[PDB]
Amino acid sequence: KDAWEIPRESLRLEVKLGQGCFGEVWMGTWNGTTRVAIKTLKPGTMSPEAFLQEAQVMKKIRHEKLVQLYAVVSEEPIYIVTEYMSKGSLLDFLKGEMGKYLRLPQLVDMAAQIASGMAYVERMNYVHRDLRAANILVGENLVCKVADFGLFPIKWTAPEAALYGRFTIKSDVWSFGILLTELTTKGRVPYPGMVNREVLDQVERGYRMPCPPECPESLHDLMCQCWRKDPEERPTFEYLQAFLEDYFTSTEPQYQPGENL
Numbered sequence: 684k685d686a687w688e689i690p691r692e693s694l695r696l697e698v699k700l701g702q703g704c705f706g707e708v709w710m711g712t713w714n715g716t717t718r719v720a721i722k723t724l725k726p727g728t729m730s731p732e733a734f735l736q737e738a739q740v741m742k743k744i745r746h747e748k749l750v751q752l753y754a755v756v757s758e759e760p761i762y763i764v765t766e767y768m769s770k771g772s773l774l775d776f777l778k779g780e781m782g783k784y785l786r787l788p789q790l791v792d793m794a795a796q797i798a799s800g801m802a803y804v805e806r807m808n809y810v811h812r813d814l815r816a817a818n819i820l821v822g823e824n825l826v827c828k829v830a831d832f833g834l835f836p837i838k839w840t841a842p843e844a845a846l847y848g849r850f851t852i853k854s855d856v857w858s859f860g861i862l863l864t865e866l867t868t869k870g871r872v873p874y875p876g877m878v879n880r881e882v883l884d885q886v887e888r889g890y891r892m893p894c895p896p897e898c899p900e901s902l903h904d905l906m907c908q909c910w911r912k913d914p915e916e917r918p919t920f921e922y923l924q925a926f927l928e929d930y931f932t933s934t935e936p937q938y939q940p941g942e943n944l
């Protein structure tokens with residue numbers, strides 16, 4: 684049978700990390716040596732084949748900025764096993780104890796890594812549909828990987844996708860722009876004070892988030908390209924990656940540290 688299959692005895696579940704109507708998530712050990720994240724399926728909540736769809740996808744994806752599948756147990760009770768990311772979610776990391784020490788340089792490097800991951804998704808002709816800080820994992824050495832915890836996130840979703848169900852890599856680019864604001868505000872909810880309804884009215888009317896405090900205008904400019912009304916006007920993740928990797932030399936060479944960024 685499949686080469687991803689592992690014996691049940693090789694997986695230890697050590698710390699519960701969350702729950703849902705379809706299962707749970709745990710940190711644990713695989714082969715008594717490898718720390719892992721584990722996703723379970725509640726028997727009786729959702730069909731196995733519908734659940735293992737995710738694992739099937741994850742077998743065909745391989746990239747250093749994508750959370751990596753490690754193994755599965757594909758007879759109920761089901762287990763999906765991936766690499767473990769020591770710092771947890773980008774969102775939690777941004778707003779917690781570490782967040783006070785991150786400046787533009789680390790934050791833009793995180794963005795470039797995320798764009799790199801998304802650029803692979805771009806080349807592979809996949810769509811993400813839920814790119815946001817909550818679906819980014821952080822590891823040692825500020826390593827950031829794209830994940831999908833299957834967690835409507837209107838505030839992160841391109842208008843044409845939210846309104847008309849048109850989800851492309853270009854609506855992923857819009858989400859990335861919103862992700863840029865999470866990075867520069869240390870994980871704050873976008874469109875502060877506005878509910879979903881006003882967000883949709885306002886954005887359709889052409890409103891866009893302002894340059895966050897201490898964020899270089901040139902980075903907010905980039906956010907605004909990600910938020911172009913016309914999907915095809917938005918940049919590629921290939922471009923986004925290259926722009927963020929070169930940012931402090933090509934775009935903002937006179938950058939000087941500040942109080943928060």
Ligand SMILES: Cc1ccc(NC(=O)c2ccc(CN3CCN(C)CC3)cc2)cc1Nc1nccc(-c2cccnc2)n1
Pocket residue numbers: 700708720721722737740741750763764765766767768769770771772809810811812820829830831832
């Ligand atoms: C245990 C597991 C099982 C499945 C997944 N799957 C994904 O992360 C994922 C990523 C991309 C795709 C591709 N897909 C293309 C099509 N569109 C519509 C959706 C995305 C699918 C699944 C992750 C995990 N990992 C996981 N889950 C929850 C929490 C954590 C975690 C928490 C703290 C520290 N380290 C890890 N780790």
